[PDB]
Amino acid sequence: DLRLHLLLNTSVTCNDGSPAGYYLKESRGSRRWLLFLEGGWYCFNRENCDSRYDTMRRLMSSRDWPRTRTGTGILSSQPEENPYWWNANMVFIPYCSSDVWSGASSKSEKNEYAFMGALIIQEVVRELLGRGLSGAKVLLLAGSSAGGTGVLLNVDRVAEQLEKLGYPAIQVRGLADSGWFLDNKQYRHPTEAIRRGIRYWNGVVPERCRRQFQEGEEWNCFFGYKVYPTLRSPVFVVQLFDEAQLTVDNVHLPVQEGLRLYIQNLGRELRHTLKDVPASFAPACLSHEIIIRSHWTDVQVKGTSLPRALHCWDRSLHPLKGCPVHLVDSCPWPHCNPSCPT
Ligand SMILES: Nc1ccccc1OCc1ccccc1
Ligand SMILES: *[C@@H]1O[C@H](CO)[C@@H](O)[C@H](O)[C@H]1NC(C)=O
């Protein structure tokens, strides 16, 4: 169980103006800190956000949040469930801003909703420094789905925040799970929704990526293969046949030739975008998310599991014999890897 803390600065808020927060379980014998960003799609205009407020309200408000949450997967404290970081300080940051963690705009007489994802992350970091984060050696910013894209947009800002506050010895790193998407052609007839959302949210993207693509084109920085080369912090990417990617591509699974080629080309393109990413784990499976699932230990690429690959990453940041960090499947069809989830 991680315990809820609502933010002391009550001007940093969920969509509806209620306080944002975080769930914490401390481990005083450890200098490692794991901050996990929840996902859950997004909303991009007044009518679409009103719909979400009716039937997905925990993703827009803290009013009904429980006082505790169970840590699962990489957030478990049990070595059998979490071979990687079972002894770490654990933080779960709920997603209540509907802005893929990019916003910095308050509720006002002009704005029915507040979109403060980027500021929520900053304020969680700032309040944690008083509860032990000041003594950390490593801060791992992790996240799944919209939270995985949120890692890519925020990891370098966290590094900058800690340097300017006077903690230059804390090593900031990122782990982006199921947040690496392609702006490809649909199978039957996305970038428009992000382009509209960014204006609706006052969304912010990393500075080097913003300077490459310039005004009006910041939406490009929500796509992993375009924003990742601009990042300075070390980032491990977990992603080949992602179900959210296929949903936006209008693919629903006796497969004819046209769809067979479409699916095989998608896997080849994903593989291509990861060729020059040295810390990555990309199995040939149809699935979505992995790192907070209890059975995240079962899947393997080339004989190496995800917890092992992350441990090898840690060792590399002190090539390694028998402990690889770049693991991408080469076979071309979903589930050609025998260890894919059932
Ligand atoms: N909405 C969004 C949010 C984050 C990153 C990209 C995004 O574009 C939409 C999208 C395109 C392809 C596959 C999945 C989603
Ligand atoms: C509370 O958060 C807001 C938004 O980031 C900021 O303007 C303000 O400085 C914060 N308050 C304090 C006391 O730090």
Curated annotation (Swiss-Prot):
It catalyses: [Wnt protein]-O-(9Z)-hexadecenoyl-L-serine + H2O = [Wnt protein]-L-serine + (9Z)-hexadecenoate + H(+). Rarely expressed in adult normal tissues. The active site is at 145 (charge relay system), 242 (charge relay system), 288 (charge relay system). One of its GO terms (biological process) is negative regulation of canonical Wnt signaling pathway. It is found in: Secreted. GO terms for cellular component: endoplasmic reticulum lumen; extracellular region. One of its GO terms (molecular function) is palmitoleyl hydrolase activity. Coiled coil: none annotated. Changing residue 145 to A: Abolishes enzyme activity. Unable to mediate serine depalmitoleoylation of WNT proteins. Keywords: Glycoprotein, Hydrolase, Phosphoprotein, Secreted, Serine esterase, Signal, Wnt signaling pathway. Glycans are attached at residue 9. The keyword NADP does not apply. Its EC number is 3.1.1.98. Induction: Up-regulated in hepatocellular carcinoma (HCC) with high intracellular beta-catenin. Belongs to the pectinacetylesterase family. Notum subfamily. Carboxylesterase that acts as a key negative regulator of the Wnt signaling pathway by specifically mediating depalmitoleoylation of WNT proteins. Serine palmitoleoylation of WNT proteins is required for efficient binding to frizzled receptors. This is Palmitoleoyl-protein carboxylesterase NOTUM. It comes from Homo sapiens (Human). The gene is NOTUM. The chain holds residues 88 to 451 of 496 of the full protein.
